[PDB]
DNA sequence: TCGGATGTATATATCTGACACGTGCCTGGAGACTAGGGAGTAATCCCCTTGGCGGTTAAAACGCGGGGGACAGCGCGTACGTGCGTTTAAGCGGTGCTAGAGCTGTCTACGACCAATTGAGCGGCCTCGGCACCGGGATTCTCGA
DNA sequence: TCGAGAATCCCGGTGCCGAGGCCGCTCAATTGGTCGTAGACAGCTCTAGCACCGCTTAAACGCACGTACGCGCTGTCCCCCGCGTTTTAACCGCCAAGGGGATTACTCCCTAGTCTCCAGGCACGTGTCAGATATATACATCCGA
C-alpha cells in the first residue's frame, strides 16, 4: 500500500487534506492523525447526503440527480436541515406545504 | 448613459407570483411599494459590499465570486457558483 | 432644506428644518404653525418612532421627505 | 491552469452507494462547495479550540471535540465512531 | 360563461408555482436596476452575467422567506389577507431594522 | 380605600425597569443548574462566577423574549399575552423548528 | 427543583419587559424554554471542560460557550 | 519608542507582537500596528466621551456599567455595531407602549 | 504570580485626556478590556482573511483600511480611515 | 345530491446536446533519514469549594370581592378576484469590436533574526474622599364625591 | 370638574471601603545590521462584455362586474388583580477540612525539513442515449340547476 488513503481503506484523499491543513495557517504544527479523521468524517457526510439524494431521485422515476432532489433530501431530514439552517441552495425550490385554514371547506 | 426610474421594472404580476410561491392567497393593493423598498435596500447593501470587495481587487469588473463573498459575510452563504 | 409632514387628516405641511435641528425644535415648530402640543404629536418616518433630543443628521433624513403624524390624546 | 475539485472522489462514493445512478454538473458543484464549507468550519473550530487550550499542535483529540461541538447528537456519535475506526485501522499497519 | 369562485384559481397557482423550480422575475429589468444601483457607488462598472444571476437568486430566496413569515403573521392576526403592517411586524421581530 | 387595576402594574413597570438588579433567587438557580448538569456528568464542581454569568445570560434572553411576545400580543389587538404569542415569536425568530 | 422558579419571580421578570396582564400558562411556557436554553448552554460548557481535562467548570468556559452561539457576553474577562 | 513618534496613546509594540504571534499571516508590514492602534483609540475615546457625558448628566463622578449601557444604546451607530451583545448590570431603556398608557 | 496584561493604563490616559475630572469602576475596566479585545479580534481576522483571499502572504495598511470600511458603519468608517491615515502619514514623516 | 366543461395525469415518437469514458503527461506525493523543541509524567503546595448550624425576617403562599376584558353574533359597504381585448416590450438569432482580464520576466526595496541594553509596565501598600444608609420634610397624583 | 393620602423626590447628616497614587523590580521593546525573496512594473495576448438590428408573440395594462370579507356595535360570563393574613426558607455570619488547580523539573519521541523518484489526476477529445417537445387521450375536479 503506497498511497496513504489505501492504508486506511478510505476514498477521500489524505495527502491533499494534510497539505491544505498545513498551508491553511490553522496551527504552527500538525499531527499525523488529523487528516485520516477529517477525511473519514467528510466521506461519511458525503455518503449520507448522496444516498438521501439517490433515494429521492429514485422516488421520481429518473436516473440522474438534479438540485431539486438535493433540496428535497436536505429539507426532509431534521438534523441535516438544522445543520444547513442558514444556507440557500440554487434552483432548489421550496417544500409543498399549505396552511390548513387556507384550504376550502 | 444615465439611468433613472428603473424600480418600476419589477411589475405587479411578478410580485404577485412571488407571493403565490410563498403560499399567500389574498393580496391587498398596497404591499407593492414596501416590497420594492425592501428589495431596494437589500440590493443596495449587497451591491455596496461587492463594490468595495472588487475595489480592493484593483480591477474594473465585478465577478460573481465577489458577490458570493459579500453574501457569505452577512451570514446568508449560497451554494452553486464555486468557492 | 425643507421636508413635509402629513397627519391622518391628509393635510401635509412644510417643515423648514436643518440637520442640526432636533425633534424638540421641530415639535416647537408644529406648535408655532399648527398649535398642537407635542404630547399628542406622534411621528413615523421609515417605520421608526423618534424620541426627543437627537438630530436629523443622525438619521440622515433626506430632503422632500414626508412623515406620518397622529394626535395621541 | 489546474482547477482542483472533489469530483472524482464524490463520483466514487456515489458509485459505491448506488450502482446505476448518474450525476449532473450543478449537483457536483454543490457537493464541492458543501465539502469545502464543512472542512473550513471544522478546521477553524479546531484551531480556535487549540489556541484556547494553550497548545501549539493540532491532533485527533481537538478534531473529535470539534465534531462533538458542531454536529448534532446521533450524527456526532456516528462520525466519531467512523473516525476512531479509521484511525485505529490506519495505525494498526 | 364559466365563472370560478374566488380562491380556486389562487389555489391552482399556489400549487403550480410551488411544484416548479425556476425563477420568476424577468432578466433585463433586473439587470437594468442592478446597473443603475451600482452606478452611484462607482462609475463605469462592468458586470458579469453570473453575478446578476446570483443577485437574482438571493433576492428571490429573501423575498420568498419574507412573504412566508408575513403570511404566518397575517393568519395569526385572524385575517386572510396580508397587509403592510404584517410586513413591518415580521421585519421587526426578525431582528432587522425597520 | 382601593386602587383600580392597571395603576400599580404601571408603578412596578417603572420601578423594575428603572433599576439594574437581578430578580431570580440565587440558591434555587444554583440547585437547578447543578441538577441539570448532573446528567452530562456527576460530581461536577462550579465556580460562583460561572453561575452568575449563566444567570445574567438567562435573564437577558428571557427579558428579550418577553418583550417580543408583548409586541406580538399588542399587534394582535390584545392586551394580555398568551402562549400562542410565545410560540409565534419563537417560530418567527427562527430558533424553533 | 425546576418548580423553584416562583410565579412572582417570573411575573417580575416579565414586568421588566413591559407587559401589563398575565394569563395562566405563561409560567409553564417560560419554564420549558428556560429548560431548553440551559440544557444547551451547560451541555456546551460541559463539553468544553471535558476537553480541558478538569473537574471544575470555569466562567471562561461559559463565556466561550455563549460566544459560540452568537450570544457573546461582556464583563467576565472574555 | 514608537507610539511617541505617531503621537498616540495605545502601544504600537504590543499590537505588533499580538499580530505577529496570532498567526494571522506569514509576515506583517511596518504600517499595520499604527493604523490599528489609531482606530482602536478613536473608538475607545468616542465610547468614553459618551459614557462621561451620561455620567455627568446624573450628577455623579464615576462611571458604572449602567452609564456605558445607556451611552451605547442611545447612539444609533454604536448600537448597531454592538447588536448581538449584552452588558452585565446594564438594564433596559425606559420605554412604554403608547396604547398601554391610561386613557 | 502570573503577569496578566490589560489595557487599563491606556484607556485611563484616554479618559483623562477627554475628561479631566472623572473616575471609573473596575467592572467598567473589564467591559472596556473585553470590548477592545473583541473589536481587535474582528478587524484582524477579517484583514487576514482578505489578505490570504486575494492570493497574498502579507498584511499591510491597505487590507486593514478595507476591513475598516467593511465592518465599521459609514460615518465612523470615514472618521476611522481619516484618523488612521493621519497617524500613518505623521509616523512616516519622521524617522 | 347530479352532469358538462374544464384541467390534469398518462402513453408514445424523436432528436438532440450533455455526460461517461479513452489518452498523454507533468507536478505533487511517497520512501528514507535527521535533529531538536514540545509535550507527557511526577511531586508539591495552598487556595477555593463543599459542608453544616443558628436566627430573623422578608418573601412566599392561600383565600376573597369584583369590575374590566376576551369572545361570539349581526349588519354593511367597499376592495379585490375574474374574465376580456388591446398594446408593447422581452426574448431569440446573428454581427462587430474593442477594453481589459490574465500570464510572463525583472530587479528592487522591505521584512525576519540575531546580540546588547534598558525603562516601561506589573505587583504590593496605603490613605482618604466619594458613595451608601438613615431620618425628615415638601410635592403630586390618584381614587372617591 | 373638586376633595384627601400615600407615594415619591429632595435635603442634611454620618459612616465606611474601593480607587488613585507611590515604590520596587524583571522582562519585553529598542537599536545597529545582514540577507533573501514578494511583488510592483512593463509587456503582450487572446477573450468576453457591450452596442445593435430585425423579427416574433407571449406577456403586460386597463376596464366591467360582482361578491365575500374587514370592521364596528352589542352583549355576556368569567377570571386576574389588589388586600389581608399565615407560613417558611434565604441569607448572613461563622467555623473546618481537603482535593484539585497551578507550578516546577526532568526526559523522550514526533514532526518539519531535505532529497530523489514516480504515478494520479487533469486538460483534451469523442461517441450516444435520457429527457425535453409535441401529440393524443382518458381520468379528476369544479360550478349550478
CATH of the domain at D37: 1.10.20.10
In chain A, residues with a C-beta closer than 8 Å to the C-beta of H24 are 25
In chain H, residues with a C-beta closer than 8 Å to the C-beta of F79 are 100
Residues 6+ apart with CB under 8 A from B8: none
In chain C, residues with a C-beta closer than 8 Å to the C-beta of H98 are 42, 72
The Cα I87–Cα G13 span in angstroms is 48
Instruction: Give B 15-74 residues with CB within 8 A of chain I.
Output: 49, 52, 56-57, 69, 73
| Closest in I18, I25, I61 to H32, CB measured | I61
Q: Identify whether A98 is part of a domain.
A: no
Judge: domain C2-71, CATH 3.10.20.90. Answer: yes
* Residue of B46, B79, B83 to mutate, interface with A, max A Cβ within 10 Å: B79
The β-bridge relationship of strands C12-16 and C2-7 is: antiparallel
Q: Do I30 and G78 touch (CB under 8 A)?
A: no
Alpha-helical regions (H) of F26-95: 26-38, 48-75, 83-92
Owning domain of residue F69? 1-97
Distance J58 C1' – F5 CA (angstroms): 25
The Cα B77–Cα B66 span in angstroms is 12
* C-alpha cell read off for G56: 471544575
Which experimental approach was used here?
Answer: cryo-EM
Residues A40 and D83 sit within 8 Å (Cβ to Cβ): yes
The Cα I30–Cα I35 span in angstroms is 9
Cell 479509521 found at: D86
Query: What is the count of structural domains for chain I?
Result: 1
CA distances from H20 to H17, I31, I44, I84 (A): 5, 25, 11, 20
Q: Do A31 and D59 touch (CB under 8 A)?
A: yes
The Cα G66–Cα G76 span in angstroms is 12
Owning domain of residue I48? 1-93
The Cα B7–Cα E69 span in angstroms is 24
Q: Do D29 and B82 touch (CB under 8 A)?
A: yes
DSSP run (H or E) holding I24: strand I23-24
Residues I68 and H39 sit within 8 Å (Cβ to Cβ): yes
D abuts C (3+ Cβ pairs < 8 Å):
no
Query: What is the count of structural domains for chain H?
Result: 1
Q: I50 touching B, CB under 8 A?
A: yes
Size of interface D-G (CB pairs under 8 A): 13
Q: What DSSP assignment string belongs to chain E?
A: ---PPTTHHHHHHHHHHHH--S--S-HHHHHHHHHHHHHHHSSS-EE-HHHHHHHHHHHHHHHHHHHHHHHHHHHHTT-SEE-HHHHHHHHHHHT---
Q: Do H55 and I22 touch (CB under 8 A)?
A: yes
Q: Do H98 and C59 touch (CB under 8 A)?
A: no
Q: Identify whether A18 is part of a domain.
A: yes
Q: What share of chain D is helix, strand, coil (3-state, %, to 5)?
A: 75, 5, 20
Residues C3 and C17 sit within 8 Å (Cβ to Cβ): yes
Residues H82 and I39 sit within 8 Å (Cβ to Cβ): no
Q: Identify whether A15 is part of a domain.
A: yes
Kindly identify which residue of chain F lies nearest to residue A78, measuring between CA atoms: F97
Cell 404569542 found at: F85
CATH dotted code for G1-78: 1.10.20.10
In chain F, residues with a C-beta closer than 8 Å to the C-beta of E85 are 75
Q: Identify whether A103 is part of a domain.
A: no
Residues A95 and E65 sit within 8 Å (Cβ to Cβ): no
CATH of the domain at H62: 1.10.20.10
| Nucleotide nearest E15, from its CA to each C1' | J8
| Closest in H10, H26, H87 to I57, CB measured | H26
* C-alpha cell read off for C5: 409632514
Q: What kind of fold does domain B1-83 have according to CATH?
A: Histone, subunit A (1.10.20)
The Cα G20–Cα G14 span in angstroms is 9
Q: What DSSP assignment string belongs to D51-86?
A: HHTT-S-B-HHHHHHHHHHHS-HHHHHHHHHHHHHH
The one-character DSSP state at C70 is E
Nearest residue (CA) to C1' of K112: A29
Q: What DSSP assignment string belongs to G1-57?
A: -GGGS-HHHHHHHHHHHT--B--SSHHHHHHHHHHHHHHHHHHHHHHHHHHTT-SEE
Kindly identify which residue of chain G lies nearest to residue D45, measuring between CA atoms: G68
Amino acid at each position: 500500500a503506497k498511497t496513504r488513503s489505501s492504508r486506511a481503506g478510505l476514498q477521500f484523499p489524505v495527502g491533499r487534506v494534510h497539505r491544505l491543513l498545513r498551508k491553511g495557517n490553522y496551527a504552527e504544527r500538525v499531527g499525523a492523525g488529523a487528516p485520516v479523521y477529517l477525511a473519514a468524517v467528510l466521506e461519511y457526510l458525503t455518503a449520507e447526503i448522496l444516498e438521501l439524494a439517490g433515494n429521492a431521485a429514485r422516488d421520481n422515476k429518473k436516473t440522474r440527480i438534479i438540485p431539486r432532489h438535493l433540496q428535497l433530501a436536505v429539507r426532509n431530514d431534521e438534523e441535516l436541515n438544522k445543520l444547513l439552517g442558514r444556507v440557500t441552495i440554487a434552483q432548489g425550490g421550496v417544500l409543498p406545504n399549505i396552511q390548513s385554514v387556507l384550504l376550502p371547506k | 448613459k444615465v439611468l433613472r426610474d428603473n424600480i418600476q421594472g419589477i411589475t405587479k404580476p411578478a410580485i404577485r407570483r412571488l407571493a403565490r410561491r410563498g403560499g399567500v392567497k389574498r393580496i391587498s393593493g398596497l404591499i407593492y411599494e414596501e416590497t420594492r423598498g425592501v428589495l431596494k435596500v437589500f440590493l443596495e447593501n449587497v451591491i455596496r459590499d461587492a463594490v468595495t470587495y472588487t475595489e480592493h481587487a484593483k480591477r474594473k469588473t465585478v465577478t460573481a465570486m465577489d458577490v458570493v463573498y459579500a453574501l457569505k459575510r452577512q451570514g446568508r452563504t449560497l451554494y452553486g457558483f464555486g468557492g | 432644506m425643507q421636508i413635509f409632514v402629513k397627519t391622518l387628516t391628509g393635510k401635509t405641511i412644510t417643515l423648514e428644518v436643518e440637520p442640526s435641528d432636533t425633534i424638540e425644535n421641530v415639535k416647537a415648530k408644529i406648535q408655532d404653525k399648527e398649535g398642537i402640543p407635542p404630547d399628542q404629536q406622534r411621528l413615523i418616518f421609515a417605520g421608526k418612532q423618534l424620541e426627543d433630543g437627537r438630530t436629523l443628521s443622525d438619521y440622515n433624513i433626506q430632503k422632500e421627505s414626508t412623515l406620518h403624524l397622529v394626535l395621541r390624546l | 491552469t489546474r482547477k482542483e475539485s472533489y469530483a472524482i472522489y464524490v463520483y466514487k462514493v456515489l458509485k459505491q452507494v448506488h450502482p446505476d445512478t448518474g450525476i449532473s454538473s450543478k449537483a457536483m458543484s454543490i457537493m464541492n462547495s458543501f465539502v469545502n464549507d464543512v472542512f473550513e468550519r471544522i478546521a477553524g473550530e479546531a484551531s480556535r479550540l487549540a489556541h484556547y487550550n494553550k497548545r501549539s499542535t493540532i491532533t485527533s483529540r481537538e478534531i473529535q471535540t470539534a465534531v462533538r461541538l458542531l454536529l448534532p447528537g446521533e450524527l456526532a456519535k456516528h462520525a466519531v465512531s467512523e473516525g476512531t475506526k479509521a484511525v485505529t485501522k490506519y495505525t494498526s499497519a | 360563461p364559466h365563472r370560478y369562485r374566488p380562491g380556486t384559481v389562487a389555489l391552482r397557482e399556489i400549487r403550480r408555482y410551488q411544484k416548479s423550480t425556476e425563477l420568476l422575475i424577468r432578466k433585463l429589468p433586473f439587470q437594468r436596476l442592478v446597473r443603475e444601483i451600482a452606478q452611484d457607488f462607482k462609475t463605469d462598472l462592468r458586470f458579469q452575467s453570473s453575478a446578476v444571476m446570483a443577485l437574482q437568486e438571493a433576492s428571490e430566496a429573501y423575498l420568498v422567506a419574507l412573504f412566508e413569515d408575513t403570511n404566518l403573521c397575517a393568519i395569526h392576526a385572524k385575517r386572510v389577507t396580508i397587509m403592510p403592517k404584517d410586513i413591518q411586524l415580521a421585519r421587526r421581530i426578525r431582528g432587522e431594522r425597520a
